[PDB]
Design a protein around this motif. Structure first.
Motif, PDB file in Angstrom:
ATOM      1  N   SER A   1       6.996   7.617 -10.994  1.00 48.38           N
ATOM      2  CA  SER A   1       7.395   6.093 -11.057  1.00 48.38           C
ATOM      3  C   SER A   1       6.676   5.342  -9.765  1.00 48.38           C
ATOM      4  O   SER A   1       7.031   4.176  -9.856  1.00 48.38           O
ATOM      5  N   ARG A   2       6.035   6.143  -8.992  1.00 48.33           N
ATOM      6  CA  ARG A   2       5.681   5.610  -7.593  1.00 48.33           C
ATOM      7  C   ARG A   2       4.129   5.642  -7.475  1.00 48.33           C
ATOM      8  O   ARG A   2       3.682   4.955  -6.376  1.00 48.33           O
ATOM      9  N   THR A   3       3.627   5.690  -8.787  1.00 50.86           N
ATOM     10  CA  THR A   3       2.110   5.633  -8.232  1.00 50.86           C
ATOM     11  C   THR A   3       1.681   4.225  -8.564  1.00 50.86           C
ATOM     12  O   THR A   3       0.364   3.814  -8.134  1.00 50.86           O
ATOM     13  N   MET A   4       2.489   3.415  -9.295  1.00 50.37           N
ATOM     14  CA  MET A   4       2.373   2.256  -9.413  1.00 50.37           C
ATOM     15  C   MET A   4       1.415   2.139 -10.934  1.00 50.37           C
ATOM     16  O   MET A   4       0.936   1.301 -11.241  1.00 50.37           O
ATOM     17  N   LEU A   5       1.178   3.511 -11.296  1.00 48.58           N
ATOM     18  CA  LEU A   5       0.246   3.327 -12.489  1.00 48.58           C
ATOM     19  C   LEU A   5       0.791   3.954 -13.662  1.00 48.58           C
ATOM     20  O   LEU A   5       0.394   4.169 -14.772  1.00 48.58           O
ATOM     21  N   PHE A   6       2.024   3.904 -13.408  1.00 57.69           N
ATOM     22  CA  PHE A   6       3.074   4.333 -14.584  1.00 57.69           C
ATOM     23  C   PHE A   6       4.361   3.648 -14.932  1.00 57.69           C
ATOM     24  O   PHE A   6       5.136   3.322 -14.065  1.00 57.69           O
ATOM     25  N   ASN A   7       4.204   3.173 -16.232  1.00 58.10           N
ATOM     26  CA  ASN A   7       5.105   2.305 -16.925  1.00 58.10           C
ATOM     27  C   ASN A   7       6.457   3.049 -17.148  1.00 58.10           C
ATOM     28  O   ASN A   7       6.855   3.736 -17.781  1.00 58.10           O
ATOM     29  N   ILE A   8       7.564   2.551 -16.395  1.00 57.93           N
ATOM     30  CA  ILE A   8       8.720   3.164 -16.424  1.00 57.93           C
ATOM     31  C   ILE A   8       9.477   2.962 -17.408  1.00 57.93           C
ATOM     32  O   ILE A   8      10.685   3.141 -17.562  1.00 57.93           O
ATOM     33  N   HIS A   9       8.836   2.391 -18.532  1.00 51.91           N
ATOM     34  CA  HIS A   9       9.475   2.150 -19.757  1.00 51.91           C
ATOM     35  C   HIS A   9       8.993   2.803 -20.981  1.00 51.91           C
ATOM     36  O   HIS A   9       9.715   3.425 -21.963  1.00 51.91           O
ATOM     37  N   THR A  10       7.712   2.435 -21.135  1.00 50.69           N
ATOM     38  CA  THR A  10       7.096   3.068 -22.138  1.00 50.69           C
ATOM     39  C   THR A  10       7.037   4.866 -21.792  1.00 50.69           C
ATOM     40  O   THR A  10       6.418   5.607 -22.561  1.00 50.69           O
ATOM     41  N   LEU A  11       7.271   4.983 -20.468  1.00 49.60           N
ATOM     42  CA  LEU A  11       7.289   6.376 -19.830  1.00 49.60           C
ATOM     43  C   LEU A  11       5.881   6.922 -20.069  1.00 49.60           C
ATOM     44  O   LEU A  11       6.157   8.138 -20.007  1.00 49.60           O
ATOM     45  N   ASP A  12       5.016   5.982 -19.593  1.00 54.53           N
ATOM     46  CA  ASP A  12       3.686   6.674 -19.715  1.00 54.53           C
ATOM     47  C   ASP A  12       2.781   5.877 -19.043  1.00 54.53           C
ATOM     48  O   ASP A  12       2.951   4.873 -18.652  1.00 54.53           O
ATOM     49  N   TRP A  13       1.634   6.478 -18.604  1.00 59.94           N
ATOM     50  CA  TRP A  13       0.536   5.859 -17.772  1.00 59.94           C
ATOM     51  C   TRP A  13       0.198   4.450 -18.420  1.00 59.94           C
ATOM     52  O   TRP A  13       0.798   4.259 -19.688  1.00 59.94           O
ATOM     53  N   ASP A  14      -0.066   3.417 -17.792  1.00 57.05           N
ATOM     54  CA  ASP A  14      -0.502   2.146 -18.027  1.00 57.05           C
ATOM     55  C   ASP A  14      -1.527   1.682 -17.851  1.00 57.05           C
ATOM     56  O   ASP A  14      -2.296   1.305 -16.883  1.00 57.05           O
ATOM     57  N   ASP A  15      -2.244   1.850 -19.155  1.00 54.00           N
ATOM     58  CA  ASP A  15      -3.611   1.257 -19.380  1.00 54.00           C
ATOM     59  C   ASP A  15      -3.955  -0.036 -18.505  1.00 54.00           C
ATOM     60  O   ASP A  15      -4.969  -0.011 -17.899  1.00 54.00           O
ATOM     61  N   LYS A  16      -2.983  -0.747 -18.910  1.00 50.06           N
ATOM     62  CA  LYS A  16      -3.291  -2.190 -18.042  1.00 50.06           C
ATOM     63  C   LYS A  16      -3.694  -1.711 -16.687  1.00 50.06           C
ATOM     64  O   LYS A  16      -4.789  -1.818 -16.283  1.00 50.06           O
ATOM     65  N   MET A  17      -2.595  -1.209 -15.986  1.00 56.40           N
ATOM     66  CA  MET A  17      -2.824  -0.801 -14.611  1.00 56.40           C
ATOM     67  C   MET A  17      -4.067   0.212 -14.471  1.00 56.40           C
ATOM     68  O   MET A  17      -4.487   0.028 -13.363  1.00 56.40           O
TER      69      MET A  17
ATOM     70  N   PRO B   1       0.767  -1.009   0.067  1.00 59.60           N
ATOM     71  CA  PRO B   1       0.053  -0.046  -0.019  1.00 59.60           C
ATOM     72  C   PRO B   1       0.918   1.261   0.096  1.00 59.60           C
ATOM     73  O   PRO B   1       0.358   2.381   0.145  1.00 59.60           O
ATOM     74  N   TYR B   2       2.134   1.187  -0.176  1.00 51.87           N
ATOM     75  CA  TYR B   2       3.023   2.306  -0.145  1.00 51.87           C
ATOM     76  C   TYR B   2       2.829   3.216  -1.180  1.00 51.87           C
ATOM     77  O   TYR B   2       2.636   4.287  -0.936  1.00 51.87           O
ATOM     78  N   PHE B   3       2.533   2.562  -2.328  1.00 52.98           N
ATOM     79  CA  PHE B   3       2.146   3.249  -3.719  1.00 52.98           C
ATOM     80  C   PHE B   3       0.628   3.985  -3.827  1.00 52.98           C
ATOM     81  O   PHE B   3      -0.315   3.049  -3.076  1.00 52.98           O
ATOM     82  N   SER B   4       0.748   5.019  -4.723  1.00 51.02           N
ATOM     83  CA  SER B   4      -0.493   5.632  -4.919  1.00 51.02           C
ATOM     84  C   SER B   4      -1.665   4.977  -5.316  1.00 51.02           C
ATOM     85  O   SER B   4      -3.028   5.179  -5.091  1.00 51.02           O
ATOM     86  N   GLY B   5      -1.225   4.258  -6.499  1.00 54.15           N
ATOM     87  CA  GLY B   5      -2.509   3.410  -7.169  1.00 54.15           C
ATOM     88  C   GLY B   5      -3.764   2.961  -6.549  1.00 54.15           C
ATOM     89  O   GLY B   5      -4.806   3.357  -6.901  1.00 54.15           O
TER      90      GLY B   5
END
Lengths: 499, 498, 497, 498
Positions: free
Chosen positions: C185-201, C132-136
């Motif tokens: 990077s911390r939201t857990m909602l963001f793809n550290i690669h694609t460098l953008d929000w992750d739809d999946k998530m 639960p550390y993350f925002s998501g």
């Protein structure tokens, strides 16, 4: 004439002296605290010398302050902290080591060899005891394996062994008398409670010169006299002795079968009178020797808790968190709960019915928003929980669920505790007006031996419940609240390292 | 046969010490008793608690060291000097509580005497002064206060007595009723010259001689006690002295012109003036002290009602400290008191002022004055007061100390000590053993029974732990001193009588 | 325009610094604010409070140094990493307090995420891990908590934010609605690669992408504020970063293989992997850090929940200290703990345990145990945890640290400082300024507007006040730690799920 | 525009308040700033910290309540009364700290004035007394105290200003160099009849007229301020009163004979003498107040240097109390002070004594006196003190007051309140909002801009949340007062004139 009777109360943290009349009233009380010694975390020693000095000087204090003379004293009564072990030079009257307190965990290893060798059943059957460092036995051997030529001198009868009773009397009677009681003896782990005499294997096994044991005697009886100066020609007969928890059972008049009390001192002690018959426990309890209605040998079930009022004194003194042992309640009532915290006062192992000398104290359920109060209050609550714990061992061995719990002791004063106490068990708690019942008992015992009172019924209406507490809490809740304890309890287990 | 015991009844506690033949402190017990303050300016103690504490102590120090009743050559007795007890001879119970030396209640009474021109006589014969401090007024007061007492007193059913007197009585189970010159000369009922009760005085205050104890030498077997033990085991009480006087003696200040300062609940400075009773013009007292033999001597004395007691006020009342040696700790957290002054007149003034109407005060407070300044200043009142009397002391005496020898509990504070010197401009010697008051009583008791043959035996016994030397220039010292006077004036005559 | 201002939004207080061109602090302000523990194991702040504090400190640093708005070239910004706010863009009124990163409430949610098999994704697309550390979850939590939220959420009526976001939004009066990488990077909602929000998530949590702000770079003019003063008077906000990342940068641990530990509210060890996004084996995280120009980089992170807050707890809550410097005072009154262990899992475990059911505990009490023993044990708990991360660090990192760059308030503790060396059997480098988390943000803002040219200028500032070196025997060390591990195991899973 | 903001710059903290049409408080900020005491008797503050904190508060209370510039109809300002500041016009940098009104430091300067026959003139034209309390002496001090001040000040260079003055000018960047009647009044550099700077005074004190700001009316748009926000938003500053008069006005004490007592750092008792200026033949200050419309009016003032400050002392310095509200707790554990008295002359005297040389003091200390008696005595002084002024005032006013309308944060103390009642033998009237100082400054500013058109609007605003009636016998009441007076007299002239 002799209108008064005195009770010496040798406690674990302080030595006391009380003065009564035929009416059974305290005219006077004096009390002196002595020092605790912890030379290693887990160990506790006392200066036998300091045990002496305090008791003595308090004896005087109660009289002197009262304007009471040696001559108005019918007799002396002696109660004591149960298991602490001293051993001294018969010549010098000088101890060859500190007293090892009933709480010390030093003989754990030794208990281990007992275990290994299969003496559990015997010991259990023959002594009513369990193998724990709680007992005299292991301690003796220790001082013995510790002091260089000690076993020899011991056989040669140069060294003496004694419980606190035994030590006070002897110093008292210049060296004259070297005796002990039933109640006391039964805790040594060297005494057969059927036989009512020492126990050969036990001595054997522990390897201890028979040469050093005092002589067991009845609880109510004349053993010697004391000259505490005064006028001259005056001597005070010392005629009553009892290991303190037992004195307190007696002082409560729990002389008949199925009668029980709770005592809240340094530790907590619950005992039920099992009559002429001695029950064997299955619920982690100890079979032991109490006092019949006449000072005669009775049997009891007893449940022992190492830490009760000592925890509070830790908060005060060590923790510096309350600045009055009654501050405790003040603090504890400042919160509606403990915010989920639990304290586990296994400062000196567990002891009962867990019997875990490797367990260390602990705190659980800590969160950023937990404050002192919550800790104080948890600490209190821990007392109650321990009680329920033994209280349960009991009914299980006995088949009776108390209607009300009769208590006594210093902490009984704490209404928080009492109430909580009631809440948690789901039982009525009854508080007397006089909570020093331990010294009453010794008084009582000693008085009998010499006319003072002629029978128990004399005293039958002196004792009165100052207060009865009743549970104001949900089972559900009570149960729940008890559930976490148990879980905390286990986590406290086996902290210490046995090689 | 191997030891000697001193009994030391303090204003604040009862203590008991064990000494051997080589004058070592083998063992000690200390026990505290309540101070009762019936009304502000009043001080009582309970005679019984006094008895209790002291008894319990004696037993404890022996039992503690594993000493047998039978190994004690004798018992010496030192006690707080002026406290008065009046009890029923018959049943051994007090008619009132001990009225303390500090109690100010007899102020009114003092007024009368003054008027009646009694002053000269008092001063002249007792060497005292008309102050509520002395026992005299206290007896009367109790007498006046107790209904039909005089009678029984007259018809002898009641005993009068100072601590020693009460102690020994209790210990001889009523057998002996004694006192000694040191104590006797503190009641205002005894002639320091004629060495015996003054009739004018007895009359004057109206006290039946019937109640007065027997006055004896400070060194002499007066009787035996039975504390139990081996049977036919009985101990001799062979020494008796007022604490200050005992202190003086335990310092071996048995020669004319030798003085000490004792830091106790209060402070008492004394000077041995030999065989001659030197009269004080300057505010000091003339008194009975001990000669190298326990023989009578005289002394010049400065009495200061508050010393270490201020410190305990701070600790227990004011709650400002965690301990009294914590005092040195806060006091040194600061370099001055920021103008602050403390006039520790909780119980009147005392030498050399003698104003029972003065009351405690603090002056020169500013918005940024904190506790440490306040603590430090308490300490200084201690040093200020001393200088006062010392001053009186050289005037009267004619002497001019090259150093001031001290003792008492407070002596351990080095802050105090250092400051003391500086304010005085004199060196200060602090002995190894600060408890010279029990020693004196020991040495007295011991001389009594052949324990030691003489005083010269205990001389190489003394040992200076420290000598403090002044670290200031007159300019400072007087200035600080100046401020001091000003305060004082401000603190006098607070309470009302009119 | 001669000064640079760093905004420092901590878990406990809001701070504000001013730096001359020399990279000297000119002045500073602070303002504490309230932690709300609605329930044991829950932690919350008031979004306004954060705001308020952060404002007035800003006005105060200025005002108190007689520095005028017109001298300020830029506003740097750092902040507490994961706390979650969601407000109504309408009014700008939060629909719920901030959910602090420490908070454990979304443990249920995390559980189903574990059930549903998502571990492998998260750890892979975020480098995060399931806690639960993350925002998501916090987001999700609120959404599910607040009534017809998801509506407006999707309508575009509500906005989501991380602190920097919340800040920047208030400042620009609602005009900007941005965030940087490190933070993202911390939201857990963001793809550290694609460098953008992750739809999946997004999808997995049920979060309208229409409540999300814009992810931007760390050094970059994002906008301006108006703080009053000489009219037309306007200030540009050109730096953003997670405190941790900010510290890391301020420490110039810019090349891959660089790590520092910071000692604040919790502890955070970070090692710069450069462009290499290493994947953790040992219980660590993989995030986004900054290279020498604000450009993205990667990092390994050891994240410890309690550290300075432990000490705070003693002061304010236990009242065993009058002053948090007294902490040392006490600790040093003793020589050892008397066998005691403290386990600061007040808000769950953390790295590398990842136990949200763990709860603070104290062990090995004997009668002769006193407060000092305990205070000392609190401090030691800090030094322990860290070796733990370090260990895992060198595990996943493959490199062995010869020395440790350290910083943050808690480092002024020589005791703590020395114990730690000892225990690591590593040297410890302690700097001249531990305010490095503010240096970090300044820097970033400064570069942006050209206050500063390159890092290289910076450098010469890094001066090492002191260095500690291991006093204990390679054996003691192992024997003390050992105690540590066991205590730990007893605290785990105290909480009933 | 639905709000007003009052800025309340106090001796020890700076607050900021937001209210609406109903004048409801909606939010508050408060920030303490450091006291500085370079030397015992002296109080300086830092213009900068005062600024710094006053800003932050203002901003803190708005950012927090989510309020933007655009809702602020105006800004009122209230301030600690006499504290002086002088700074370089050019830089806006001070040439020295603020000399707080409590600072005594110009004591001498006062000595010369007196020695020069100025008393009457000054009282006659300024309505004041020659004391270090006022600005006048503080400027010269600064001026002389710094090498080449005098000059530059003449040559344009330097500005002088009190606390109201100094805020508006930072708030306006240099734009406004204004002050109000109420403020001007207390500089003892301004003619209260003439409504302008007093030429002689300036002459006397040697102050260049070039450094003075402009006097204005208490309720009037002096100008505007830019706190940022959304473009082209200036806020207007249309109100200024010294906190005391602001409390007077805030109190609605709009007519002659109408009085109040404020309990804050100090204690100020103020009566509205309506349109005329009553002269004090009893030791009070004749001063400028505000009429129902923020116009010149006259008042009588009783100024008490320490009150709530006393309690801060106990808490942070003495350490004695846990929270400044712990006072009552403690105070209520004893039923008396055991004869103790506290004379809080931390900064000298003050009405009606005007003893710059006095310092605070504690009388009647006895052994059994504890912290509680001291804490309670600390409160009582507050009460004593009011009685002192209270009576002067009636003598001067010719009015026997019936009830005492109080305010201030200390008013929160029931004890104090009942006590106050008791010793006054008067009924005390406790309001419902204790922020009256800020209310006063809000009204003014809101009046000036038509936020409200008149008082009547709010006559039904202000409530009596509580009335305290005495419960003490004359005798004993007279009795304790009596103790107080002796105590006071004994504090006087402690300090020495060189």
């Amino acid at each position: 004439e002799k209108k008064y009777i005195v009770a010496l109360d040798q406690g674990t943290t302080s030595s006391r002296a009380v003065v009564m009349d035929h009416d059974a009233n305290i005219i006077s009380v004096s009390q002196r605290e002595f020092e605790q010694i912890y030379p290693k975390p887990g160990w506790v020693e006392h200066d036998p010398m300091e045990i002496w000095a305090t008791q003595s000087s308090t004896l005087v204090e109660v009289l002197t302050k009262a304007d009471i003379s040696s001559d108005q004293i019918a007799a002396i009564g002696i109660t004591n902290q149960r298991e602490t072990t001293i051993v001294w030079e018969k010549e010098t009257g000088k101890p060859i080591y500190n007293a090892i307190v009933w709480q010390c965990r030093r003989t754990a290893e030794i208990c281990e060899h007992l275990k290994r060798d299969g003496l559990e059943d015997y010991i259990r059957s023959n002594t009513g005891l369990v193998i724990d460092p709680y007992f005299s036995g292991t301690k003796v051997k220790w001082i013995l394996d510790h002091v260089e030529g000690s076993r020899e001198r011991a056989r040669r009868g140069e060294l003496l062994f004694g419980t606190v009773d035994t030590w006070l009397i002897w110093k008292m009677t210049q060296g004259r008398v070297h005796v002990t009681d039933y109640t006391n003896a039964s805790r040594t782990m060297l005494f057969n409670i059927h036989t009512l005499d020492w126990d050969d294997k036990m001595l054997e096994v522990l390897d201890i010169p028979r040469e050093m044991l005092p002589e067991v005697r009845r609880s109510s009886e004349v053993y010697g006299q004391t000259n505490i100066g005064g006028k001259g020609g005056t001597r005070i007969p010392i005629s009553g002795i009892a290991g303190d928890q037992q004195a307190a059972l007696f002082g409560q008049l729990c002389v008949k079968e199925g009668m029980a009390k709770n005592t809240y001192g340094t530790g907590c002690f619950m005992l039920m009178n099992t009559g002429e018959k001695a029950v064997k426990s299955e619920n982690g309890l100890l079979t032991t020797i109490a006092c019949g209605p006449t000072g005669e040998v009775n049997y009891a079930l007893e449940g022992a808790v190492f830490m009760a009022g000592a925890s509070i004194q830790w908060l005060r003194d060590e923790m510096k968190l309350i600045n009055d042992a009654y501050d405790s309640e003040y603090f504890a009532t400042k919160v509606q709960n403990t915010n989920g915290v639990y304290v586990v006062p296994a400062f000196t192992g567990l002891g009962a019915p867990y019997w875990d000398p490797y367990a260390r104290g602990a705190i659980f359920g800590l969160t950023r928003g937990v404050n002192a109060n919550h800790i104080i209050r948890a600490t209190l609550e821990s007392i109650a929980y321990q009680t329920r714990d033994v209280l349960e061992a009991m009914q299980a061995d006995s088949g009776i669920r108390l209607h009300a719990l009769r208590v006594d002791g210093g902490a009984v004063a704490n209404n928080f505790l009492m109430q909580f106490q009631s809440d948690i068990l789901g039982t009525r708690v009854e508080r007397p007006e006089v909570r020093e019942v331990t010294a009453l008992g010794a008084a009582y015992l000693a008085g009998l031996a010499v006319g003072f009172w002629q029978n128990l019924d004399e005293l039958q209406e002196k004792a009165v419940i100052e207060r009865e507490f009743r549970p104001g809490i949900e089972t559900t809740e009570r149960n729940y609240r008890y559930a976490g304890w148990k879980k905390a309890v286990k986590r406290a287990m086996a902290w210490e390292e046995h090689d």
